[PDB]
Structure formats: C-alpha cells, structure tokens
C-alpha cells in the first residue's frame, strides 16, 4: 500500500 | 514501459457532501501512473449545467502536476465555487453536472461527469423560490454514486506533434 500526494501546482507552466 | 494508457483514472473521491453551491469545490484524485510522464498532467474543473451548460460551461479551476512519478497518485484537488449570477434564483435549483477532466500535453484523455443535486434545504424556499438566489440556503448534493468516465484514446509520450489545438470556428 503505496501513495503519491504530489504537490499539483495552479497552471503555473514553465518552459 | 508504455501500456497504452500511461495514466488512468482510478476514481475521484467527492470530499463535499452535503455541501452548498457557493461552497467550495472539493475532490480527491486517483489514478495510476504507469510510467513516469516526460510531459504534464492538467487537471481542472468545470461546471455545466445540465447538459449544454445554460450557464456557459465555466472552467471553475485549473492544477498542473509534475514532476509526476511511478504507481497511485493522489491529492486533494479545490475548485472555487461558481457565482449564481450566471445562474439565476429558479435556474441553479436545478441538476447539474460537474465535469473533471485531465489534459496531457493537450490532449484530453479523461473526463468525469458528476450530477449535482441543488435545492432549497428549507421548505419554504424549495415551494416558494424568492427573487435573489439565496445560495448560502442552496444544498449542493453530488451523486457521487454514479460516476460518468469518459475516456478518450490519445497518444502517450511517443506522439508527433501535428494538431493538439482544436480548430478555432467562429461562433456566434
């Protein structure tokens, strides 16, 4: 039993 | 390590129940990540009403996820509540649907579908509905029992880059 919480960002898109 | 689909949609988890309409939408994403994404994962929120959304479809919230790894992914994703002045006192009293849709690179893959039940909690209100939506006293009920996945098929991660970007038609 594994998780992933991530940190989802708010759009914020970089290149 | 490309099994067709490299994220599917294991379920989303309707935190807010019962909640109000003007209350802040709350669900809890998961799905698995079969191998980790060279691009990103767009996940937003938006509300139709109905079916054609007599409110205009409104994207109430967009999150971005990345670097996104290996194996379940979950978070608990927030959506601002929309503003009954796009829905007038008799026309958000109705049900509606909300839909949650993840975007890689573009292309759109999963779109969930869930109705909502919005009522007067008080009697009076619900018989006799007044001229100015009182929202706080609308109940937002999601009938998170009946989930409507909608999956369409993309490409992953080996994809040429030809038309990602829907045909802009002049409407109206």
């Known amino acids: ?15 | 390590g490309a099994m067709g689909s490299i994220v599917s949609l294991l379920g989303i988890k309707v935190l807010n129940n019962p909640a109000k309409f003007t209350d802040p939408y709350e669900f809890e994403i998961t799905f698995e990540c079969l191998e980790s994404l060279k691009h990103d994962l767009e996940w937003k929120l938006t509300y139709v009403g109905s079916s054609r959304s007599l409110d205009h479809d409104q994207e109430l919230d967009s999150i971005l996820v990345g670097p996104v790894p290996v194996g379940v992914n979950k978070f608990v994703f927030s959506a601002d509540p929309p503003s009954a002045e796009l829905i007038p006192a008799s026309e958000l009293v109705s049900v509606t649907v909300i839909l949650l849709s993840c975007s890689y690179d573009g292309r759109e893959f999963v779109r969930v579908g869930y109705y909502v039940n919005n009522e007067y909690d008080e009697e009076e209100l619900r018989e006799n509905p007044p001229a100015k939506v009182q929202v706080d006293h609308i109940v937002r009920n999601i009938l998170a029992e009946k989930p409507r996945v909608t999956r369409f098929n993309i490409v992953w991660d080996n994809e040429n880059e030809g038309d990602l970007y829907p045909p802009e038609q002049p409407g109206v």
């Open chain 1, 1 to 15: 039993l594994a998780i992933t919480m991530l940190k989802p960002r708010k759009k914020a898109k970089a290149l």
